[PDB]
Each structure stands twice: as C-alpha cells, then as structure tokens.
Ligand code: FES
C-alpha cells in the first residue's frame with residue numbers, strides 16, 4: 001500500500017545514510033551508483049542473473065510501478081479511463097489521437 | 113451528532129425539490145430539434161419496443177417524438193445531477209468510434225469516467241477479480257450509444273442490470289430500451305445530437321458537483337456557529 | 338450482495354425486495370434518487386416478440402396537405418438548380434415557395450387544384466423564380 | 473387538436489409502377 | 499450466516515473427451531435461503547463434489563429471488579404453471595396445514611420460509627426444471643396489495659373460522675373505485691380436473707392424504 | 714407561446730425536401746481519409762464520396778459541395794434477417810464544389 005511505500009522510502013533513506021557511514025563517505029552526496037558499488041563489495045555474488053544479486057535500490061524501483069489501489073479512501077479511481085482495465089495504454093492512445101487531430105488542424109536510421 | 117444533521121441537510125435536501133439543479137434550463141424542444149435529435153433509422157430497422165417513442169414515419173424514416181424526449185431527458189439529467197451531487201461514480205459508455213475521443217475528453221473534463229473501447233467480458237460482473245475486491249463499481253452508467261458495432265445491444269446494459277447499476281441511455285429507433293433504467297429516445301448518429309448530449313450531461317454533472325461543494329461549504333460554515 | 342436476475346423485475350424492485358429481506362444491509366446510493374424521481378416506465382426486461390397476423394405497428398406516416406402540392410411540383414419541375422441548404426433552419430426551397438404561393442391563392446377562395454397550380458406557377462414566374470420543366 | 477398534426481392519406485410522392493412494355497397492349 | 503444451503507440433486511456427468519475418453523464430473527444443484535422470503539438456486543459443475551458445492555452455493559447466493567409470502571407463512575394465491583414439461587400446481591393453505599409438496603419443493607419452501615402449502619407435480623419431474631419453474635411461479639405471484647392497487651378496490655378476506663366478519667387485507671393507495679366490479683354469475687376460469695374430482699369426492703386414491711411425518 | 718414539436722417538424726427543411734431521391738443538397742466535408750470525403754448534409758447520416766480526379770486537392774475540411782441524394786439511409790433486408798441491415802451512411806453523388 002501507499003503507507004507501506006512511504007515506510008519503505010524512510011527505511012531506504014536510513015539505510016542509505018548507514019551505508020554511507022559504513023563506506024566512510026558523505027551521506028549527502030552518496031549517489032545510487034555508490035550504493036550499488038558498496039552493496040556489490042559488501043555482498044559479493046557470482047550469480048549470473050543480475051536481478052538475483054543483492055540490491056538496495058530506491059523503493060520506487062524495487063517495488064513494481066503498478067502502485068497500490070488506484071483509488072482513494074472514497075473509492076473513486078484517480079484516472080478517468082480506469083474502468084477500461086488498461087488506463088495507461090488507452091490514455092496513451094487518446095493522447096496520440098489528440099496529437100493526430102491537432103496535426104490535422106495545423107495542416108529510421110539510428111532508432112527502432 | 114454531526115451525521116444526524118449532515119445526512120439530512122445535504123443528501124436529503126435536493127430530494128424534496130422536483131428540479132433541484134434546474135436541468136430544464138439546459139435543453140429545449142427547439143434546441144433538440146436543431147440538434148437533429150428527432151431523426152431515426154428507417155422503418156425496417158425499427159425496434160418494436162421503441163414504437164411508443166416514435167412520433168411517426170416520414171417517408172419510411174422514423175421520427176422520434178421530441179415531446180416524450182424532453183420529459184425523458186429531463187428525468188435522466190435530473191437523475192445524473194442527483195448522482196453526481198452524491199459523489200457517485202458516473203461512467204459513460206459508447207462503442208461508436210466516431211465519438212470515442214469526444215466522449216473520453218468530456219468525461220475527463222467533467223471529472224467522471226469513460227469506457228469507449230472494447231468492453232472486456234466481465235468488466236462489471238467480474239470486477240472484483242479484475243480489479244481487486246475493494247473496487248467500487250460505478251453508481252450510474254450513461255450510454256450515449258446502446259448498440260455495439262455488430263448492432264446488438266451493448267453487453268454493458270445487461271451487465272449493469274445484473275449488478276443493479278442504473279443506466280441512463282440514448283436509445284435510437286433501432287435500440288432496445290427494455291433494460292435501460294432511464295431511456296432517452298433520440299438520434300445517436302448525428303454529430304450534432306451527440307455533441308448536444310455530451311454538453312447537457314457535462315453541464316448537469318458540473319452543476320451538480322458545484323452545488324454539492326457550495327452546500328457542503330454552507331453547512332460546514334453554519335454548523336460551526 | 339445483490340440479485341443478478343436481470344430477467345426478474347427491475348433493479349429497483351430487486352434492490353427494494355432484498356433490502357426488505359435484510360440481505361442488503363444498506364441501500365445503494367442511487368436508491369433514494371430512483372425513489373424520489375422514478376422513470377416513466379419501470380425497467381423490466383421484456384422479450385421483443387415478433388408480430389404475426391393482423392397485428393400491425395401503430396406508427397403513422399407523416400403526411401400534410403402541402404404534400405400533394407409538393408409531389409405535383411416535383412413531378413412537373415423536379416429539383417431546381419437551387420440546392421437544399423438543410424443546415425439553415427430558416428431555409429425556404431423553391432418547392433416551399435410554390436407551396437406558400439399556392440396556400441395564399443387558396444386563401445383567396447380558389448379551389449381548382451389543377452388551375453391553382455398554373456396560377457401559382459404564373460405568379461412565381463412573374464416573381465422571376467426559375468421554373469424549368471422536367472420535360 | 474392542432475392543424476400541424478399529420479393527416480392520413482395515400483403517399484402523394486408514390487411514383488407509378490414500372491409497367492411492362494406490353495402492358496395495356498393487345 | 500442467516501442463509502442455509504440445501505442440496506437438491508447431485509449427478510455424475512460423464513463427458514467424452516478426445517484423449518481421456520470418459521471423464522467424470524459432478525453437477526450439483528443447490529438452493530440457498532434465509533427463511534425470510536429471500537432464496538435462490540444455482541448449478542455447479544466441478545471435478546470434485548466439494549468444489550461443486552462451494553461453486554453452486556456461492557453462485558446461488560448472488561441469484562436470490564424474493565418470494566412474497568402471505569402472512570409470512572404461505573403463498574398469496576393458487577398457482578398453476580408449466581415450465582418446459584413440468585406442471586406445478588401450488589395451493590395456498592391455512593396455518594397448520596404444513597407442507598404437502600414434493601420433497602424438493604418442501605426443501606425450497608423451508609429455505610424460503612413457507613410453512614403451509616400444497617403442491618402437485620405432474621409431467622417430467624426433472625429436478626432443475628421443477629426447481630426453476632417453482633421459483634418462477636413463486637416470484638411472479640401477485641400480492642393482495644398489488645391486486646388492490648391494480649383494480650382500485652378493497653381486497654376483503656372472508657374466513658369461515660371468523661364467520662361473516664369482513665377482513666380488509668389490502669386497500670388501494672390511490673383513488674378507490676366507485677363502480678362495483680361486475681358480478682358474472684358464471685366465472686370464466688380454467689379449472690383442474692383433479693381439483694374438481696377431489697372436491698366432488700370421486701378422487702379415490704390409496705395414496706392421497708396418507709399420514710406422513712411432520713413437515 | 715412556444716412553437717410545438719409538430720410545427721417544427723412540419724416546417725423543417727428536411728420535411729419540405731420530400732423524398733430524398735435525386736434531390737440537390739449542399740453538404741460540408743467534415744472529414745477526409747485519403748481520397749474519401751465524409752460529407753454531412755443535414756441528414757441523420759453522412760455520406761462517403763471519392764475525391765474527384767479533377768480539382769481533388771481543392772476539397773478540404775469545411776469545403777461546401779453539391780450532392781445529389783439517392784437515399785438518406787442505406788438499408789437492406791437479407792434472407793432470414795428479421796430486421797433491416799444498415800451501413801449507417803447515406804448514398805449521394807458528389808457533383809462538385811459549391812461557390813457562394
Ligand atoms: S406490367 Fe402490367 S400488364 Fe405487364
């Protein structure tokens with residue numbers, strides 16, 4: 001839940017400070033890359049699957065971005081296309097269609 | 113002590129008045145006629161349950177009696193305004209791909225929800241499995257088009273009847289208004305008519321929400337003193 | 338919580354009966370609004386039976402007295418060069434002008450249809466309206 | 473009750489049936 | 499917790515599949531009712547009997563009818579309906595008459611909350627057809643209040659135990675009609691030969707009115 | 714004193730048009746998909762007309778054109794179809810651009 005995510009964020013901040021203390025670096029300038037290097041040094045793992053090695057990333061990345069329930073206490077969903085079951089995809093399609101309509105109003109090499 | 117007065121003075125206050133939100137101002141028979149609301153399909157496509165709402169055929173072209181349409185639209189708009197005033201979830205449904213963008217945009221602007229895409233099986237009867245048991249089903253569903261793309265009745269009508277969700281609906285001469293809670297006989301293919309319906313529903317919902325906010329603020333202010 | 342028997346009664350009847358039976362602890366949000374402002378017809382599911390025999394739909398055909406004049410005019414002249422601007426609610430077609438002149442002349446007291454037609458055509462020709470015949 | 477109500481009559485615009493080329497001929 | 503579940507039939511349906519040939523499955527018809535007029539029924543198919551029971555009852559609890567009961571103990575009027583090939587003739591009965599009905603009807607009536615009723619089942623005794631025809635007939639019955647509202651007249655009950663005292667059980671909520679209902683000397687109704695034969699006493703049966711356990 | 718629905722229907726230009734066969738109407742191109750133009754002419758349904766081989770680029774959204782109407786609604790009843798089957802569009806012939 002959202003409160004669980006807040007608790008995880010607080011725990012991650014405290015752990016980041018503790019890891020900066022352990023590695024003897026400034027907690028205020030301890031980037032995510034420093035966190036990863038410190039974790040790899042303190043908890044070495046030769047497992048080939050990188051997703052299986054120890055990780056202490058931000059909760060925004062460790063937890064799936066599917067988020068908690070998509071409605072508040074009142075139960076009203078936040079997104080107006082929620083009942084489509086694919087609110088992200090259909091919102092993206094709606095935005096693209098609006099862009100095409102605006103293009104109608106007004107009027108390959110290094111990418112895949 | 114808060115609830116005993118809150119519930120009455122907010123929820124039950126509009127129920128005493130016939131037209132609390134003055135939805136009759138929004139539309140007129142002249143306005144509906146100008147929006148080509150009265151036009152219907154040919155007599156061959158006519159659905160028999162729509163016969164009471166058909167004024168007559170003009171050269172094998174059914175005309176929808178706007179006198180009955182006015183009363184039905186009054187009832188439907190009043191019901192929608194009351195549901196919005198009670199902060200109920202309002203879901204527009206229309207599989208007509210022509211107006212999908214407009215309907216979705218209107219729903220987003222009015223603060224309510226839209227479903228103009230392929231209605232997956234069990235989006236209502238199986239909502240607890242597809243969303244989690246804590247999901248809150250819509251308290252009112254508004255069909256701007258009650259027929260799917262194969263001209264069968266939209267499955268959402270039957271599903272909403274199954275889940276006891278009232279349905280406001282724009283029924284054309286070929287539609288089936290049996291299970292629609294608040295049928296509104298009218299043209300659903302003319303862009304002008306669909307735009308008129310969208311404007312009326314958006315205005316009713318917005319007026320209802322604004323009136324709810326004003327009444328809540330007034331009640332909270334007076335209760336403190 | 339609720340009956341999915343959409344073929345039995347209406348949502349209002351089912352909900353009210355379940356509330357009376359105590360199955361539904363609390364009324365749904367829409368219930369009070371429905372009770373205060375019920376629709377004209379209770380939404381009860383009905384099977385659309387097919388007609389047979391002498392039974393016939395009561396839908397009438399929208400005919401007016403001016404329809405005869407319009408048919409005669411379109412037979413004699415047909416669609417003129419002036420197209421129909423149906424987007425204009427105040428539009429008056431050439432056939433509509435002919436019908437108006439015919440009604441004016443009928444109000445004068447004339448009764449012969451096939452003579453009033455020629456008189457109306459003469460009056461419109463004096464007015465300058467193009468009245469090319471079909472053949 | 474009002475003049476604007478439609479009246480009952482045979483279709484005035486009904487075009488005649490396309491008679492066969494020999495119809496009315498012996 | 500207010501609802502009780504009762505099994506009406508369990509059947510071992512064998513389906514012929516391409517690989518496994520004859521495959522066993524259980525089809526179970528259950529009825530659930532709270533005893534206060536709210537009841538329903540459902541079918542459940544499964545591989546295990548307990549799964550079928552769970553499915554059937556959890557689905558029947560979502561398909562609840564509401565059976566209006568006269569005085570909370572019996573039906574409002576005599577009913578006679580045919581569902582498919584099953585004829586059900588239910589008779590309203592006074593208090594203490596008990597349930598003299600097909601055992602499935604007895605179970606469903608206990609679930610609904612009907613204490614006094616008669617019921618004869620003729621034709622096919624298909625349990626599912628009988629059950630859903632019974633539910634249809636019970637749901638479609640018209641209450642005294644509905645009758646009074648429809649015809650705009652007082653519904654006056656005459657009881658032999660109460661003598662000639664007229665008891666008003668339902669009065670129309672709208673205007674009351676002034677013109678008396680036409681009193682045809684000969685009503686135009688379709689009687690049952692069984693009922694007429696029983697009333698005249700010619701319905702000799704070594705199986706009718708047999709003493710049976712309390713229902 | 715408000716005009717009744719019957720009066721509006723009686724005096725409607727669509728009612729005055731009588732039969733829609735071979736009538737001349739002024740429509741507006743409200744949508745373009747390649748060489749297909751969707752024209753609304755005040756009827757219940759629009760009509761799809763191919764872009765003319767001559768002056769085709771001169772037709773754009775909002776261009777007013779002249780149409781010869783064949784039927785407001787294209788419906789047909791097939792074998793065993795209890796109800797008429799419609800394609801939700803009209804049948805008209807695109808004469809060409811209309812100039813005021
Ligand atoms: S069409 Fe009439 S005689 Fe042949």
Ligand SMILES: [Mg+2]
Nearest residue numbers: 284299300301
């Ligand atoms: Mg339509």
